[PDB]
Amino acid sequence: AYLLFYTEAKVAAAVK
Amino acid sequence: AYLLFYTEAKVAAAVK
Amino acid sequence: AYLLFYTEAKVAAAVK
Amino acid sequence: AYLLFYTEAKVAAAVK
């Protein structure tokens, strides 16, 4: 799995 | 587009 | 341009 | 000291 920080603003995290 | 930081280590960025 | 994450708290993003 | 970004969501920062 990847660790992911993403935003378009708040930064949200996800582990996919 | 969304700004993305990702890693499996080095953190890398992308703009998608 | 640069991608920037910054904070003094919430992390905010910018593309400059 | 180390710079730290952490989350369980909102990403938060710390300088320890």
Added chain:
Amino acid sequence: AYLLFYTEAKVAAAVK
């Protein structure tokens, strides 16, 4: 567990 980005430089990630 927490998702963690940390640095003293390279940013490294960890999931604790």
Added chain:
Amino acid sequence: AYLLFYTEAKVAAAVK
């Protein structure tokens, strides 16, 4: 001071 993560790639950090 601000904590800054930035990149044009590797993510680098600064405290200003």
